[model samples]
Target: HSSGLVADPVVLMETAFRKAVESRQIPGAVIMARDASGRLNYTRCFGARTVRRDENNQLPPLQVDTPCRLASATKLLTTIMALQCMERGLVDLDETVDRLLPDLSAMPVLEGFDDAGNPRLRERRGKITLRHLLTHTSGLSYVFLHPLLREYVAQGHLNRFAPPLVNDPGAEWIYGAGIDWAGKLVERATGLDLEQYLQENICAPLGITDMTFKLQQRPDMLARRADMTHRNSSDGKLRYDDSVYFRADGEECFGGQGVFSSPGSYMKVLHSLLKRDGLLLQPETVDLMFQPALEPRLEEQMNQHMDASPHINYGGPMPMVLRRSFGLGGIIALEDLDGENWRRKGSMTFGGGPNIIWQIDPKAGLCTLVFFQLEPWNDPVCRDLTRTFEKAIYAQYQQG
Candidate 1:
């Protein structure tokens, strides 16, 4: 009654990734496979290169081993790192920012005169906490939109948004840069820098070696920087974004945004989350992750947690709730998302994004990961591949 009628996650994954490469959506990619026990099964790569070259009247091949920027996906790692600090008894998730970072209290607030260009400080209230930062509930306005950010930019105090304590903490989810502040908190809680702590605890423990947060400064990485492509609205064609290779070091080092690696490296982190491996986190912590920090509701009721906003991205983890709700690090897909009789209930997993799908099904003793770097997170091709992979794994179930 448990298996969902699948055979293998690997062969299905290979076919999916290869199809993406062939379609010129991405250059290349690597995928890591893991079983329900959280054991490594195999790693595979597909594609020619990470760049497109016009040779012989054909696009250049992409190298699958090459790495790409993870963007918001980096949040998953930073959240886990914060949890890791918590696991070590070095951090209190409930503690406010004023306790861990006293200097922030003196920092000027963002305020302005009523359309008169006069400068003032925003009202002082509430304090930011690890839980607030991790869950994006700190009520901290992202600097770009905050009145303080506008003043700071005018005064040349800051070029980008800095984490600020607003009127409320844990008020709602804003999806801003709270994790970057947590990254600093991680440094203070642990003497090691972000890279060192990640290497010492996360990457090392997970046995992931090829990934790097500080690759921007590395000598080898610069030389291997693959051509990054972005859609050019002027021509409606994917053009190489040269600046992607020269991104400022500020971005590369900040744990909030910068992370680059092969598909294999990222999947290892995914597997650990799916299994909720004891070495990484306790079961209660995993349970707390999916619990709503804002409004108490089923994971599917995520829309109820946020104030009406312009960004559609602000909604709760909907389609994803079928198996799990979101926890601190990623979306927690519960078992019944597919209905009560669903094979694997309480499925824990998160996405690299709309394009990538990763899940751990403990009931079925299976962990499957897939990557398809495109939009519409539920692209039919990607969904078909996921079902194909899941069906294959279910077919191979040998235990009871």
Candidate 2:
């Protein structure tokens, strides 16, 4: 028995991921992690582009440059764009967003359904600010997460108006369409679409060209595209999923969920942030991103989320609810995570689905992206995989 220190992280990584590939637990994954100092870095791609073997005897091997959907991971990209608008004075963090987006001017809050099952809606008492969108403090939430929202959607609500808020502005944390609206804020302020704004301000500045909101436009990236896969609840078997979350031909980009990039391509953005070189943001601006940004007054919702996280995030490694607060780009850890290889206090993290994970830890001087083109997320094996890889990362790189 020996400690995890190794002469080559490559060999350690191979030992870490090769078994998952051979066992077919995951069709493919690209694991990338680096520190601010850049001395300890590990990036590797394992397995094939498609797990579908019955249709084709031959499978194209996944390269280090394989592209996959960033899913909710797109939030970080959009969040950065919003922050840039703040830097340029086109937007302010605490300004009422209603003027910026006309629809937000008169918002609806879902108090609940009345006795007869009719929706009980009321005007929002508080104004939503840009800060609410970036930090998940906005009352907006995905319907599936709440029964009332689900019921509201099911009862012919599309007869029709914008989705209603679950809580008042600044009432609590509910991760929903806030960033999607924030993306619109960028477009409204810059007179540029999400794709154009990101390309000029964020992607191009970092010297990254592979990331795109439009995939088919770049036939080259589409070719290098890693087919999405899933873990079957039937028997935990892996299979190819022939579906795309966003339209390749669509003009609108969802800032919250639509974007694609190779793990290696995204690493540059993370590295620049880790290096604190300010390629994409000002020193002061970037510095504000990783700290806890939520108001203490918002703990009413924070407590509910934390209390429920044990069951919600059960298979995962992070003690999310217990120690998490909203940072500009992702969830910020309020205290040192208690577990082997868990992220340090002050770390910021976000993930995309059908599945992917990205984390930034200033305390440890580390950034990581565990890219998986798998769906039906929360597969036990995949959770174990991240935990194992995360442990190996700290042990091999940080020796913590």
Candidate 3:
């Protein structure tokens, strides 16, 4: 109660994070929070960086500044970078990306498997645009999520890295490599690599020093990087994953899931957006970012897809579709549900593949970032952790 403004919320939220780690639901995590007034509530790290005994029978200690794999959470940063370029007149949302990426014209919409057990891809009905890519309406399908697409790419018919479209521009919503494609567009438009552009435009302005695509290149950062973990389906046990996805193969910097960052560093980025400081985008653009970007039908389709995926329990233990809508920056909730007390009607949220989740409730003047390195995207432990921490936060707010 030292600050006296949001003291209860800070204590309650910190306890929730501590309980999750102490219970061994996760090896370790970094959780952070702040109010809209730019006042920090709390930022804490818990548990071991490498929980399982090492070859030498020792567990590595976790530090508050430990770098975490951002996974798809990197999209928030890429989204801001692209929008900043748009603000500077370097990119046009409506502009078709065919000139810069001619191969996009040849990508067909994957329908299903034919009777002959081959992929049935249809002709693309429209062109690709920056808007479609940002909104995830550009028809690209990730092999990891779409089974047929995975088989199609695995059969050597299509390149695994360059995924195919599942629908045409504005036709449907499919979570795929659209952000990665947008990252390539950013590089092409700015005549700089994605990493360089991000550093010059987004990172430097926000004082994000350790966030970068090349973690292996920085010995100091790699030393402090959080250890990776994967859930073993056979035994339901979490195992240590020694391999890290380092920069290699001469691939373009992947804006979708490349960047690594610490919890406190990422909060600085979120704080800038929450306060509308205009370091990256104007206030109006930030407002637009939190607004719904999908048409009614498209929103319905996206919700339906997420509603069906077991891998993504959508709203966590709720077991029902929460009527989520996609925005340029992240997913937006269309309305408030009684079950989820943390998010408001217009909250903006998204997560990385490794069980990291975050949300920004501008109306509530609050945002939260929860980080944990766990496998099997959207594991129940992390999902429950997010839901519990959020409820505790709102509980204090309501009491205060």
Candidate 4:
């Protein structure tokens, strides 16, 4: 946790990135690099309001303090909050979530029979556990993305989404609508609304007040929303577009995928848990957060990562057997087959979203989140960015 190590390398990284953004290499960029000890190596922001409508279309931007919505990054927080409940003994990992949030669990089983003798809503074999929600193996099917949930939503039927086991609870890895249900469990367990519990347990302790999913509740946030840009529409590649991202009626940030935060503010919560300083959970409880809850056939789901989308795939820990067989949530990698020798092989990491990444290296004593642009599949630069950031930090340790 030595604060002195961040002086020069940080300056160099920041300067180089700023040059890249200024030259239109990217729309804009914000980064917060840290050491293995969860210490700040450098905290820098670059670029400007590349969007034509943005008032601050100038150089040297504001991403550090600015609240950039975390698309799927909110899952990280959701998982933790659920784990906090688990630690307090309010939630049991092996028990079914139906025990708490009946509205979700009480979903009507599809009353039908297939020609192949497949039973509709296959009489939910066993109970769905907290483990099922965390690992995404609950069989409820992912909302909007999964065909089951999509059809359910399309037909105005939330009940169909939660019907019978899709793959048998905890049987296989399915990025289902488990997290949203997990959110429902939080309300039931704590007798506190999702937002209230998060503020007290996760947000307040880490000094994160700016994060919000509902824009109507926050007028100040309207100006802070990053202009959502896409390569296919914005430019030939994913560049910045200030004109498009938000809706005029005040965009609704999805808790399943919406959160606005600067690299520093976002990193604060990541660091707080990784460094075990915020006292959010006990050492063992915090450690359990990274354990893998489900295992998947890497070949089959290589393109699917964390239930975010079908095209998304996970890094490093894919298809690996996690200790405790998927702790309460997150994948626990105790060993590394990759030659990189990540210091936290015994640690856990969750690579989610289209590009949002989070890693914790216990040996190096570091926790990192690389909030950057979404690039093409198997792109070397995107793959190596995290490694590069980590390697730079490791180099400092070697020199020290």
Residue-wise C-alpha lDDT for candidate 3, range 10-117, written one tens digit per residue: 566667667766776678777777777755475677777766677788667566578888888899898888887788898788888887767776777778887887
Candidate 1 lDDT (Cα, whole model)? 0.57
- Expressed as tens digits, the lDDT of each residue in 74-150 for candidate 2 is 88999989999999999989989977887865768888998999999888877899999887777887776777888
Separate clash counts for every candidate: 33, 0, 2, 23
Give the per-residue lDDT digits (tens) of candidate 1, residues 207-267: 8765677766666655554455554446444455554324655542566666766566776
- TM-scores, all models, native as reference: 0.73, 0.91, 0.90, 0.77
The root-mean-square deviation over C-alpha atoms between each candidate and the true structure, in angstroms, is: 5.9, 3.7, 3.4, 5.8
The Cα error of candidate 4 at residue 270, in Å, is 1.2
Candidate 3 lands at a TM-score of 0.90
Measured with C-alpha atoms, the lDDT of residue 7 in candidate 2 is: 54
Name the candidate that leads on TM-score: 2
**True-structure Cα RMSD, model 1:** 5.9
Residue ranges of candidate 4 with Cα displaced over 4 Å: 1-25, 36-40, 53-62, 108-121, 147-165, 233-235, 239-255, 294-311, 316-326, 337-343, 351-354, 373-384
